[PDB]
Amino acid sequence: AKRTKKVGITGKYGVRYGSSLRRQVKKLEIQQHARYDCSFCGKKTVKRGAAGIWTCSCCKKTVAGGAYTVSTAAAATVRSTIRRLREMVEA
């Protein structure tokens, strides 16, 4: 059964710290504890060890990432920016 209506994982905090703070933590803890696709072995086995460290349970691969996500939006822009600059130089 749906045990909580809206707090979700932040139900451990009870009634403390304010609803707005608990929603902000809810967004980033769902991201923090989610399993992600491995870009190497293709499985859904990538979990966060520590902030910025994302390790696949199989294939032993560890990738440097964001604090609470594997990849941040500014990082994907950088990767596309660096790819575009490298392609133009090698053109």
Partner 1 sequence: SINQKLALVIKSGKYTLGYKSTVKSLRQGKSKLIIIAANTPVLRKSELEYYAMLSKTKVYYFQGGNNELGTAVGKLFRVGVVSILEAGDSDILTTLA
Partner 2 sequence: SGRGAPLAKVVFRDPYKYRLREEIFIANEGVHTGQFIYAGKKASLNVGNVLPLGSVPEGTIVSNVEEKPGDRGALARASGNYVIIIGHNPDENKTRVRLPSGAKKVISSDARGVIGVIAGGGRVDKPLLKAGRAFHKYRLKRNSWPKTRGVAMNPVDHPHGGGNHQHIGKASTISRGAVSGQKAGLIAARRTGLLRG
Residues that bind RNA (CB under 7 A): 20, 73
Q: What is the distance between the alpha carbons of residues 14 and 20, in angstroms, rounded to a whole number?
A: 14
Of 36 and 66, nearer to partner 2 (C-beta) is: 66
DSSP state of 31: H
Phi, psi of 56 (to 5 degrees): -85, 130
Find the shortest distance in angstroms from Cβ 29 to partner 1. 27
Could you tell which of partner 2, partner 1, RNA, none binds residue 45, using a CB distance below 5 to 8 A set by kind? none
Q: What is the distance between the alpha carbons of residues 71 and 65, in angstroms, rounded to a whole number?
A: 6
**Does the footprint of partner 2 cover residue 28 (CB under 8 A)?**
yes
Query: Of the listed pieces 3-11, 41-49, 50-58, 73-81, which binds partner 1 according to CB under 8 A?
Result: 41-49
- Token pair of 8 as six digits: 């979700």
Which residue in 9, 26, 32, 43 binds partner 1 (CB under 8 A)? 43
Contacts of 53 by beta carbon, 8 Å cutoff, 6+ apart: 62, 64, 65
**Does the footprint of partner 2 cover residue 82 (CB under 8 A)?**
yes
